[PDB]
């Protein structure tokens, strides 16, 4: 017979589930400057190897169950880390399981055509050659959720066969010949436009560099539409224009090619000066009309929006660049104008 | 409408196009086709695509799951039943979960066949999954279990795997002469040394491995089994999802002037694809699908599954 | 339980291989060399020696074209995600979820042993044997399943399938498999015809 | 009641997006061919551009990805069976 209360041991379950959440998702994905090498474990010398990224032991006290309690706050350590190189990346989580669960995968893929002239083109009758160059680089054809070099890590791909398919609408022959005759005029030319509609230049920024001056030499600027700038990483961006990049030891998400941009918060200001004396937009337009102050560290005059450090000039421009919102009041744009890659869908102010 | 919309003649819907001439570099390959559109047919090039077959090796650094596969409910510092040589005597840290009837020199009696004592098959019996089912600590005079030998390298239980080498699931390194080497080790009470052995530990050599875990705490750099290597603690490897990219980015050379594609007539041979390397055809297609459709939805045929971080992981 | 005949909770859609439709006992429908295998509606293929599967599954290119044209008028100008009002609950693409896995290749992997459920001892001394009852055993290295990843990954074979619940395999009686009206163009040719046709 | 003397840090994160600055006189989209883009057709003069970005310092070589938004237009003519003819034009950055 037990004399008194029974024996038991107390656990904090919700804290242990929340301490497992913050470690597996945030503390293991910290920058490598916060980690250290474990004792008595042979670790690889190459930092782009999975044997490195797995075995760099991180302290749980860096991101433990008490970090920023009651603060909706992304870590300053984790702002510059690619959030799409993560195992909760639900696209890559879906794309990994769409092939299978094993190392050795025989695949069967249908690759879409993306070149805008020949993407929506309605071909008329005729025999055409149709010749395409395909990649085989395992850091380009594949995507890992850690960003390790898949050339060193033994990932191989081997393209056995290939076929071109083409679905034809079975149009009536005296109707598909009237449409054929109409579409062979010089007045009925099928005209297309690239959706990005931009000539894209990559300018290098050195390490720990604050000032980035670029310079377009001299040109007629007629039919110019605007700018759309974003910071990238040299590690994460392959040298396109070359068919094979031997210095590209990275197989994570490529923000240059997929739209997974994340270094937008690393911009302070933008000074656009046409022809070295004409500041743009000039004309005393903005509250600081010679530069596009994107954020302010030290604000005494109080020109910030949204309980963050983004300025009132730059929040006006970005709500007008995307939604025509800003001269008749700021409000939530509707869900059809506010797409996935838009400004307001992703603007998340924190404090 | 009846007529003037759909033909009444023998016309195919989908055509199959064998490559005319394929050439290979060490980093790229090229596929020339004849995109032959017959008489009175229109072809929207949105309906055209490349069907590619092949063999993908994801490499050993592919881990499609968090945690481990083997003994996940085990404690991370929990060792397997192992042996080691100290200073040269061999110590045994083991467990004997099975409860039998009688113990002779042939092993443990698991039952009878009439009056003949049926013993345990040393290849797979007693099973390390079968022990006692009641919770109260009854008297167990004739227990038995399985122990890894001193030649087997010592691993924690969390994440340990050995392949089975018989039909009945028993794991153990077979040797050629193809007979297993499972030695029997008889143990009795220390103050008892008639002599009746209480515990029979079937020692064995398994092909032990940690296919998805690693050690987070090594107490000893030296080789060989030791008492300090019971305290080694196993951590699961980090999950690495290796796959093709969203909308098959990186399979087709866009905006490479050396790897430009060709759509031309067979006679004039003037390439209608004029490609410029300061275009981003990939990002032009990633932003086009956003403006025309709900981008959160998953379309497997074009591998249309958008990269999306968890919103509670980025912003804590 | 749920009655799929009445509730609309259809779930055995994946158990179809092919469909052969013949009008008047000789005229194979649709005829006209329409499909890639034009004498039948191949819904799925396990062999796939000629290269006729979509969606990284085993559904054929003929059948995925027909189902995206029966519901959505999508397929002749490129396959894309249908808009959210065309894609209802009991529709095709809302419910079509293609899958794949790898299992062991028992005829190629030289160390395969078919270990039944009586002898699979993963979570050995921490999980009750063959029951949700109390634990029994010892903290012992597992033997199931075979590792598909790592440096010691087994020789694997890939199984592909799809599950498309809640839906009906629509084959429209139209000459281009599209919905250009409720009274289809092949139903108006047989209109005022006074001709009976056998259907097999 | 024993709270420390605290200082407030504010920031924003805006992923997945491009910082759009439209080349329009009121920063709005009244059309793809903007009014400042037509003001430079009738001016008929070449101007140089000197943009200057101030960024946060990172311990890593980074790149700058500026989209100079143009009209990347292709007009496709097929006059005869097997004949394909295309005229490309993008303005300003013609190539």
């Amino acid at each position: 017979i037990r004399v008194g209360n029974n024996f038991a041991m107390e656990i904090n379950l919700n804290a242990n589930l929340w301490r497992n959440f913050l470690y597996s998702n945030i503390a293991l994905y910290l920058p490598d400057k916060l980690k250290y090498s474990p004792s008595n474990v042979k670790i690889s010398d190459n930092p782009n190897t999975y044997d490195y990224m797995n075995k760099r032991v991180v302290a749980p006290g860096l991101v433990d169950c008490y970090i920023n309690l009651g603060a909706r706050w992304s870590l300053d350590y984790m702002d510059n880390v690619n959030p799409f190189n993560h195992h909760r990346n639900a696209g890559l989580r879906y794309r990994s399981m769409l092939l299978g669960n094993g190392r050795y995968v025989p695949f069967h893929i249908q690759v879409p055509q993306k070149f805008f002239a020949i993407k929506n083109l309605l071909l008329l009758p005729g025999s055409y050659t149709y010749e395409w160059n395909f990649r085989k680089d395992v850091n380009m054809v594949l995507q890992s959720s850690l960003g390790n070099d898949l050339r060193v890590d033994g990932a191989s791909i081997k393209f056995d066969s290939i076929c071109l398919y083409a679905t034809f609408f079975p149009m009536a022959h005296n109707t598909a010949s009237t449409l054929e005759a109409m579409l062979r005029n010089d007045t009925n030319d099928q005209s297309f436009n690239d959706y990005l509609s931009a000539a894209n230049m990559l300018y290098p920024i050195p390490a720990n560099a604050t000032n980035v001056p670029i310079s377009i030499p001299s040109r007629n600027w007629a039919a110019f539409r605007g700018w759309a700038f974003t910071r990238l990483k040299t590690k994460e961006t392959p040298s396109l224009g070359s068919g094979y990049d031997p210095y590209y030891t990275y197989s994570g998400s490529i923000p240059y090619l997929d739209g997974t941009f994340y270094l937008n918060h690393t911009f302070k200001k933008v000074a656009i000066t046409f022809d070295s004396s004409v500041s743009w937009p000039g004309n005393d337009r903005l509250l600081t009309p010679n530069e596009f102050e994107i954020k302010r560290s030290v604000d005494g005059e109080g020109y910030n929006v949204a309980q963050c450090n983004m300025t009132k000039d730059w929040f006006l421009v970005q709500m007008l660049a995307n939604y025509n919102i800003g001269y008749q009041g700021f409000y939530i744009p509707e869900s059809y104008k506010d797409r996935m890659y838009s400004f307001f869908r992703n603007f998340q102010p924190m404090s | 409408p009846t007529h003037d919309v759909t033909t009444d003649r023998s016309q195919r819907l989908t055509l199959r196009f064998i490559p005319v001439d394929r050439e290979d570099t060490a980093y790229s390959y090229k596929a020339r086709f004849t995109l032959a559109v017959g008489d009175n047919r229109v072809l929207d090039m949105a309906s055209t695509y490349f069907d590619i077959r092949g063999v993908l090796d994801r490499g050993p650094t592919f881990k499609p799951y968090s945690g481990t596969a083997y003994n996940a409910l085990a404690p991370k510092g929990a060792p397997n039943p192992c042996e080691w040589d100290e200073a040269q005597k061999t110590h045994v840290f083991g467990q004997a979960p099975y409860s039998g009837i009688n113990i002779t020199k042939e092993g443990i009696q698991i039952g009878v066949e009439g009056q003949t004592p049926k013993y345990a098959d040393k290849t797979f019996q007693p099973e390390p999954q079968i022990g006692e089912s009641q919770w109260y600590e009854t008297e167990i005079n004739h227990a038995a279990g399985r122990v890894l030998k001193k030649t087997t390298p010592m691993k924690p239980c969390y994440g340990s795997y050995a392949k089975p080498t018989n039909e009945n699931g028993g794991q153990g390194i077979l040797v050629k002469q193809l007979e297993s080497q499972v030695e029997m080790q008889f143990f009795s009470t220390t103050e008892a040394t008639n002599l009746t052995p209480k515990v029979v530990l079937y020692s064995e050599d398994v092909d032990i491995e940690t296919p998805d875990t690693h050690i987070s705490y090594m107490p000893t750099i030296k080789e060989g089994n030791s008492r300090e290597l019971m305290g080694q603690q196993s951590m699961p490897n980090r999950p690495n999802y290796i796959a093709f990219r969203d909308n098959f980015i990186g399979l087709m050379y866009y905006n490479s002037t050396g790897n430009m594609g060709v759509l031309a007539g067979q006679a004039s041979q003037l390439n209608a694809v004029v490609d410029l390397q300061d275009r981003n055809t990939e990002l032009s297609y990633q932003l086009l699908l956003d403006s025309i459709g709900d981008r959160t939805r998953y379309f497997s045929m074009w591998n249309q599954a958008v990269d999306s971080y968890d919103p509670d992981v980025r912003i804590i | 339980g749920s009655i799929p005949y009445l509730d609309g909770t259809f779930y055995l859609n994946h158990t179809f291989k092919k469909v052969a439709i013949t009008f008047d006992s000789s005229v194979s429908w649709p005829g006209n060399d329409r499909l890639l295998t034009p004498n039948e509606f191949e819904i799925k293929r396990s062999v796939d020696g000629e290269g006729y599967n979509v969606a990284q599954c085993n559904m054929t290119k003929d059948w995925f074209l027909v189902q995206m044209l029966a519901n959505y008028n999508i397929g002749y100008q490129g396959f894309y995600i249908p808009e959210s009002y065309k894609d209802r609950m009991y529709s095709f693409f809302r419910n079509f979820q293609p899958m794949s896995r790898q299992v062991v290749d028992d005829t190629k992997y030289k160390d395969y042993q078919q270990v039944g459920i009586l002898h699979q001892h993963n979570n050995s001394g921490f999980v009750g044997y063959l029951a949700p009852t109390m634990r029994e055993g010892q903290a012992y290295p597992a033997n199931f399943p075979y590792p598909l990843i790592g440096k010691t990954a087994v020789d694997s074979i890939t199984q592909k399938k799809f599950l498309c619940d809640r839906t009906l395999w629509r084959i429209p009686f139209s000459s281009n498999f599209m919905s250009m009206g409720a009274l289809t163009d092949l139903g108006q040719n047989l209109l005022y015809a006074n001709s009976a046709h056998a259907l097999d | 009641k024993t709270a420390v003397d605290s200082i407030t840090q504010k920031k924003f994160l805006c992923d997945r997006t491009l910082w759009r600055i439209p080349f329009s006189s009121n920063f709005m989209s009244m059309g793809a061919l903007t009014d400042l883009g037509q003001n430079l057709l009738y001016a008929n003069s070449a101007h140089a551009l000197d943009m200057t970005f101030e960024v946060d310092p990172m311990d890593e070589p980074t790149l700058l990805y500026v989209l100079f938004e143009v009209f990347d237009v292709v007009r496709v003519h097929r006059p005869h069976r097997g004949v394909i003819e295309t005229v490309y034009l993008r303005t300003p950055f013609s190539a």
């Binding site: 605007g226 759309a228 | 919309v5 | - | 989209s29 989209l67």
Partner: peptide, 28 residues
Amino acid sequence: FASLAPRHGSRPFMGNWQDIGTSNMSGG
């Protein structure tokens, strides 16, 4: 071209006249 259009009732279900071309660009 009313023989190519589906018949809602006895009237041809035509589209609009000005819905022929596209005009979408990256913000414009």
